[PDB]
Structures are given as C-alpha cells and as structure tokens.
C-alpha cells in the first residue's frame, strides 16, 4: 500500500512516496540521496514524535488511506548540528489573499 | 445521418450504471437520431439497474456542470448481450483532468458568468472560463474520432 | 530517481521527482535551459499544490480504479488557475 509524503524541514519540502511496509530508515536514505546527510545525522518525526528507524511507516500510523497523492502526510526532519540536534522547525507556506467578492 | 447513434436492435441488455465518482451523474442516451436524451440522475456512490439494448449508445456527464466523465475508462458505453445471467457493468469514473481544467471547474462553480471579467486574471483565462463543457461539442469530436478509426 | 528543486516566490524549496515535474512541459523546457527552477511569481501555497497535482496525475493516469477528486480550496483557485495556465498542466 503506497503512502505519499512531504518530508519537511525549515523551508524545504520533499515530495516522495513509499509503502506502508517501508521503514523509517528507508526514508532517511531518500533524504540522504537528495540532501546529502547520512541517516545518523537525521531525525524523522510524526507530529513531534521521534520515529524509530526499524518501524514500518504503517506501524508509525501512515496508511495509504491518509497519505494520499493529492493530500500527502508530513514527516518532520531535523539535522544534527555539531554534536547536538537542531530542534524540529517546519515553516508554513504563505497565505492566499482574501477571497474575491464575486466568489463569495 | 449522424455518425454516432443507438442501433435499434430491439435486443434487451441489462446494465448496471455504477457511479464510482464524487459527482452527481447524468446519463445520456443517444437516440436513434443521435440526439442525447437525459435519464434520471445518479448520486455519488450509487448504482442502478437499467433495461437497455444491444448497440445502444450512452455517455455520462456531471449533472450540474456537464463536465465529462469516463465509463469503463472510455467515453462511450455500448451494451452487449448478457451471458450467464450477468448484467454489463457501466463503471463511471472521473477522468484525470488537467490541473487547468480542474481550476476552471472550481471557478465556474463559484462565480456567476456575468462576473467572470471582474476576476484579476489574464484575458485568455476569461475566455477559457467561458468556453463551457458541451455535450454537443464532445459528440462532434467523438464523431470525428470514430470516423478516423 | 532524480529529484528537482522548484522554488516559490516566497523562498520555499519543493523537491520532487523529475519524472513527476516533467508533467509540466514548461518545467521540462526550463530544466533543459540546473536541476533547479525559480518561480518568482508562484507562491508556496500554490506551488505546493501544483506538486501534489503532479503526484496525483502520475498516480491515477491510466489507473483503472476509482479516481478521487483533486481538491482545490476556493481561496487558492485563481492563483492556481494562473499557475496551471503558465505551466500547462
């Protein structure tokens, strides 16, 4: 069962996809391929909860019903800074303008 | 003599229209002169058994907007004869519209045509807004495609 | 499994599978002008959505299962229409 995701850190968002049976670790390998930071330098989060490398995305709560192509679920990403880890920070997107009058 | 028309086989075919779409669906029966005739609406997620005929021609549109829908992954549905006591399924689904066409649909649903030109968009898009989905138009295209194959 | 980077006017980076981004012929043209495209007039609430459309399009095109609706909030429809028009997707 395919799950569609946004891995988000700061003002970076990765659209990628995997299986309910894929592991958290496998996602870090994707991150590493794109952002050039090894797994041991990355933490992944669901909400504010740290995910273990060995759990499946399914076990973490990502079902294909919820992590959909047109509405992907979010995985948080934080990188190691020196010896400590940065705090998870995901910046929001911009706000649309107010709705046009003729659309109300 | 229209290109696309129901053939008057007079041979019954039992069909199920299966609305696998979130749209309110309008079935259209192209009569023996190729004119579209509207049948009772199908609410999203519903199915209905219909007594149709071999060689009849059907197409399916959004009942509110006349946006085009697929039936068994194509544009037209033709009943064949039933075998083994089984109805023919007409599985009606959304196409994957272009993002453009999808945006056009949402805007048409929110804005009165008279008000299209108050929208702060490039002029070509006003034009596109106004070029509504048309059964007539689709029958023209489908007629030509049919002749080509 | 090359990814490309699409940058919004407000400086969000969206990193997507190249094959998914090539759903837009505009983006294709822009990419063979790096693996990076800067959209100075498309903001993040719009471009995020365009990215989800690419995923949706690739996932459901020639599917033969039931297709969900692509959701569009009324408050983003106009900007998204403009972007869709420019990107030809």
Curated annotation (Swiss-Prot), chain A:
CDD domains: Ubl_ElonginB. It holds the Pfam family ubiquitin. It comes from Mus musculus (Mouse). One of its GO terms (molecular function) is ubiquitin protein ligase binding. Heterotrimer of an A (ELOA, ELOA2 or ELOA3P), ELOB and ELOC subunit. The elongin BC complex interacts with EPOP; leading to recruit the elongin BC complex to Polycomb group (PcG) target genes, thereby restricting excessive activity of the PRC2/EED-EZH2 complex. It is found in: Nucleus. The modification Phosphothreonine is found at residue 84. Pathway: Protein modification; protein ubiquitination. The modification N-acetylmethionine is found at residue 1. Residues 1-79 form the Ubiquitin-like domain. GO terms for cellular component: Cul2-RING ubiquitin ligase complex; Cul5-RING ubiquitin ligase complex; cytosol; elongin complex; VCB complex. PANTHER family: ELONGIN-B, TRANSCRIPTION ELONGATION FACTOR B POLYPEPTIDE 2. SIII, also known as elongin, is a general transcription elongation factor that increases the RNA polymerase II transcription elongation past template-encoded arresting sites. Subunit A is transcriptionally active and its transcription activity is strongly enhanced by binding to the dimeric complex of the SIII regulatory subunits B and C (elongin BC complex). Core component of multiple cullin-2 and cullin-5-RING E3 ubiquitin-protein ligase complexes (ECS complexes), which mediate the ubiquitination of target proteins. By binding to BC-box motifs it seems to link target recruitment subunits, like VHL and members of the SOCS box family, to Cullin/RBX1 modules that activate E2 ubiquitination enzymes. Component the von Hippel-Lindau ubiquitination complex CBC(VHL). SUPFAM superfamilies: Ubiquitin-like. Keywords: Acetylation, Nucleus, Phosphoprotein, Transcription, Transcription regulation, Ubl conjugation pathway. GO terms for biological process: protein ubiquitination; target-directed miRNA degradation; transcription elongation by RNA polymerase II; transcription initiation at RNA polymerase II promoter. It comes from the Eukaryota. Belongs to the Elongin B family. Transmembrane segments: none annotated. This is Elongin-B.
Curated annotation (Swiss-Prot), chain C:
GO terms for molecular function: protein-containing complex binding; transcription corepressor binding. It holds the Pfam family Skp1_POZ. SUPFAM superfamilies: POZ domain. Ubiquitinated by the DCX(AMBRA1) complex, leading to its degradation by the proteasome. Pathway: Protein modification; protein ubiquitination. InterPro entries: ELC1, SKP1-like, SKP1/BTB/POZ_sf, Skp1_comp_POZ. One of its GO terms (cellular component) is VCB complex. Keywords: Nucleus, Transcription, Transcription regulation, Ubl conjugation, Ubl conjugation pathway. One of its GO terms (biological process) is positive regulation of transcription elongation by RNA polymerase II. SIII, also known as elongin, is a general transcription elongation factor that increases the RNA polymerase II transcription elongation past template-encoded arresting sites. Subunit A is transcriptionally active and its transcription activity is strongly enhanced by binding to the dimeric complex of the SIII regulatory subunits B and C (elongin BC complex). Belongs to the SKP1 family. This is Elongin-C. It comes from Mus musculus (Mouse). The gene is Eloc.
């Amino acid at each position: 069962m395919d799950v569609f995701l946004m891995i988000r850190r700061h003002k970076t968002t990765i659209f990628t996809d995997a299986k309910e049976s894929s592991t958290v670790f496998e996602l870090k390998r994707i991150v590493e391929g794109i952002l050039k930071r090894p797994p041991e330098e990355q933490r992944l989060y669901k909400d504010d909860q740290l995910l273990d490398d060995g759990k499946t995305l399914g076990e973490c709560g990502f079902t294909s019903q919820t992590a959909r192509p047109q509405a992907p679920a979010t995985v948080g990403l934080a990188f190691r800074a020196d010896d400590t880890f940065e705090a998870l920070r995901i910046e929001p997107f911009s706000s649309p303008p107010e709705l046009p009058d003729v659309m109300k | 003599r229209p290109v696309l028309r129901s053939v008057n086989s007079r041979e019954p075919s039992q069909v199920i229209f299966c609305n696998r779409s979130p749209r309110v669906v309008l079935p259209l029966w192209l009569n023996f002169d190729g004119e579209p005739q509207p049948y009772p609406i199908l609410p999203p997620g519903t199915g209905r058994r219909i007594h149709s005929y071999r060689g009849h021609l059907w197409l399916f549109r959004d009942a509110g907007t006349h946006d085009g829908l697929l039936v068994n992954q194509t544009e037209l549905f033709v009943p064949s004869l039933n075998v083994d006591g089984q109805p023919i399924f007409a599985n009606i689904t959304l196409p994957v519209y272009t993002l453009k066409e999808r945006c056009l649909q949402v805007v048409r649903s929110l804005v009165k045509p008279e008000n299209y030109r108050r929208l702060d968009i490039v002029r070509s898009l006003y034009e596109d807004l106004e070029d509504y989905p048309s059964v007539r138009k689709d029958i023209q295209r489908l007629s030509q495609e049919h002749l080509e194959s | 499994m090359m990814y490309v980077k699409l940058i919004s006017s407000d400086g969000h980076e969206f990193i997507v599978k190249r094959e998914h981004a090539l759903t837009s012929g505009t983006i294709k043209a822009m990419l063979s002008g790096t693996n990076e495209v800067n959209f100075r007039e498309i903001p993040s609430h719009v471009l995020s959505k365009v990215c989800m459309y690419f995923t949706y399009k690739v996932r459901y095109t020639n599917s033969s299962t039931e297709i969900p609706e692509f959701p569009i909030a009324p408050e983003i429809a106009l900007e998204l229409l403009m972007a869709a028009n420019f990107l030809d997707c």
